[PDB]
Design a protein around this ligand. Structure first.
Ligand SMILES: *[C@@H]1O[C@H](CO[C@@H]2O[C@@H](C)[C@@H](O)[C@@H](O)[C@@H]2O)[C@@H](O)[C@H](O)[C@H]1NC(C)=O
Ligand SMILES: *[C@@H]1O[C@H](CO)[C@@H](O)[C@H](O)[C@H]1NC(C)=O
Ligand SMILES: *[C@@H]1O[C@H](CO)[C@@H](O)[C@H](O)[C@H]1NC(C)=O
Ligand SMILES: *[C@@H]1O[C@H](CO)[C@@H](O)[C@H](O)[C@H]1NC(C)=O
Ligand SMILES: *[C@@H]1O[C@H](CO)[C@@H](O)[C@H](O)[C@H]1NC(C)=O
Ligand SMILES: O=C(O)[C@H]1CNCC(O)(O)[C@H]1O
Ligand SMILES: [Cl-]
Ligand SMILES: [Cl-]
Ligand SMILES: [Cl-]
Lengths: 74, 385
């Protein structure tokens, strides 16, 4: 028999997640890609990213601890 | 293996522009491995970046370090959790003296809680817990190098996540009770994902189950590794084409609300049929205050038919069933919603997400190796209003 009864608890919220509960990352290593400006400038990619708004975008990864800000660099 | 690289103002602007233009909130991880003679964090480079970002009016949130449990292996430097907490206190003082004095700070982005990672998290929250806005930790089920198709479909693999979540809350409740807990970086399989698995329909069982368990267990935010990038676990491939997990993520975003409820199956086995229940997302224009969203995973090799309990048993239900586009079955990179392939209309236009209205009082059909959302219309649940 492949029929299953569900039980629902609906009295009160058991938890409240953020409106940004489903968030995304970009790996810090992507900033070492020569085409970083082309990739994140992509109108197609920004359309896809807008579909997940509201969300956090966390820029981080193993490379987080091997990246140094150089305000001179072009 | 990892060498130092520099990044430019241009790179910071590329990143911020992407986030701002996409309606996303940027969190930026600072380098924790810049160390003074006596192994205090050297904040001088972070100060250069904070000043630049303030100078451009960039509203940015901060982290400091990634997987500090791994520093000894990756960089041959051991920073204990006590010292790392002191480093966070020092970053917090810099944020309070910047133009965005209320900027958020998250950490410490530890790996999943083994003995030594639990110890680091505990000593970190004792030392630095007062200045973090949320506790961040990371989770992967498997090594991407050795993961199998069977692993992606195995409830015994899915269930391992529950014990990780329980162990993080045990640390947080013993040190900083009530502090919010976030999954700072998570996916199916580490080392960049499981080839030909982490980028397929089969990846969605782990992703949707993780979302369900996280919401149910008190995790407030889940950050998916990765939106776009070199790893197999990306939501969007190198050709800017969305993978099945993108479409699953878009549906979750559109249908699933902030208020978490509970569903369970009345049978003794609560393993291969996995069910989750929230209030419907109030922003979905189709639906109204009081509506429920049920989502379900069927890891059985046959169709299951779900019966809604009183007083929902005769309500109109909107089905959103995802199945792979053939011929590659669960290893497909294409997905159909209620039998319609999901594809961009053009580079600027997401498709409409078409529901399938069920005949009221019908049982909810969930095919073998599939996942679905079900919106219960006019549910009038008081907890959801
Ligand atoms: C399918 O899986 C079987 C075990 O699962 C149980 O039996 C099947 C028919 C379903 O009713 C399911 O709800 C039960 O949990 C295996 O023993 C069997 O090898 C598998 N059959 C096929 C066709 O692969
Ligand atoms: C990167 O630079 C930091 C100090 O700025 C140093 O401690 C570390 O050894 C460098 N890493 C590598 C592998 O060059
Ligand atoms: C921190 O690093 C900067 C730049 O590498 C250096 O000028 C400064 O002396 C360092 N501070 C300490 C306390 O070592
Ligand atoms: C930064 O953005 C957050 C939303 O992420 C907002 O609530 C906060 O007040 C902002 N800070 C400033 C000063 O814009
Ligand atoms: C943690 O490391 C700091 C910095 O090296 C050191 O001074 C302190 O004694 C350490 N604490 C423990 C318990 O190892
Ligand atoms: O794929 C992995 O194994 C990840 C582990 N955490 C850091 C990272 O996101 O950079 C990835 O290396
Ligand atoms: Cl981990
Ligand atoms: Cl430690
Ligand atoms: Cl990447």
């Amino acid at each position: 028999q492949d029929v299953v009864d569900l039980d629902f608890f609906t009295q009160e919220p058991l938890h409240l997640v953020s409106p940004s509960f489903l968030s995304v990352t970009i790996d810090a290593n992507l900033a070492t890609d020569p085409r970083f400006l082309i990739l994140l400038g992509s109108p197609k990619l920004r359309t896809l990213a807008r579909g997940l708004s509201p969300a956090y975008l966390r820029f981080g990864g193993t490379k987080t601890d091997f990246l140094i800000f150089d305000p001179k660099k072009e | 293996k990892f060498k130092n690289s520099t990044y430019s103002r241009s790179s910071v602007d590329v990143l911020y522009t992407f986030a701002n233009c996409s309606g996303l909130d940027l969190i930026f991880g600072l380098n924790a491995l810049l160390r003074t003679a006596d192994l205090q964090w050297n904040s001088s480079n972070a100060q250069l970046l904070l000043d630049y970002c303030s100078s451009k009016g960039y509203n940015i949130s901060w982290e400091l370090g990634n997987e500090p449990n791994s520093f000894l292996k990756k960089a041959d430097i051991f920073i204990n959790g006590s010292q790392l907490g002191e480093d966070f206190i020092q970053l917090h003082k810099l944020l309070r003296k910047s133009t965005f004095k209320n900027a958020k700070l998250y950490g410490p982005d530890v790996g999943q809680p083994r003995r030594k990672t639990a110890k680091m998290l505990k000593s970190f929250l004792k030392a630095g817990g007062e200045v973090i806005d949320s506790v961040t930790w990371h989770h992967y089920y498997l090594n991407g190098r050795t993961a199998t198709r069977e692993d992606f479909l195995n409830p015994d693999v899915l269930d391992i996540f529950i014990s990780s979540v329980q162990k993080v809350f045990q640390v947080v409740e013993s040190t900083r009770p009530g502090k919010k807990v976030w999954l700072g970086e998570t996916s199916s399989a580490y080392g960049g994902g499981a080839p030909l698995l982490s980028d397929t329909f089969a990846a969605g069982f782990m992703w949707l189950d993780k979302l369900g368990l996280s919401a149910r267990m008190g995790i407030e935010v889940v950050m998916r590794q990765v939106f776009f990038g070199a790893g197999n676990y990306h939501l969007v491939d190198e050709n800017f084409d969305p993978l099945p997990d993108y479409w699953l993520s878009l549906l979750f975003k559109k249908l699933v609300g902030t208020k978490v409820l509970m569903a369970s199956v009345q049978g003794s086995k609560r393993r291969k049929l996995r069910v989750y229940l929230h209030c419907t997302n109030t922003d979905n224009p189709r639906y109204k205050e009081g509506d429920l969203t049920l989502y379900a995973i069927n890891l059985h090799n046959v169709t299951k038919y779900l019966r809604l309990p009183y007083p929902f048993s005769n309500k109109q239900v909107d089905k959103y069933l995802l199945r792979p586009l053939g011929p590659h079955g669960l290893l497909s990179k294409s997905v159909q919603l209620n039998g319609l392939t999901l594809k961009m209309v053009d580079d600027q236009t997401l498709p409409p997400l078409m529901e399938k209205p069920l005949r009221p009082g019908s049982s909810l059909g969930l095919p073998a190796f599939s996942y679905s959302f079900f919106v219960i219309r006019n549910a009038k649940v008081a907890a959801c209003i």
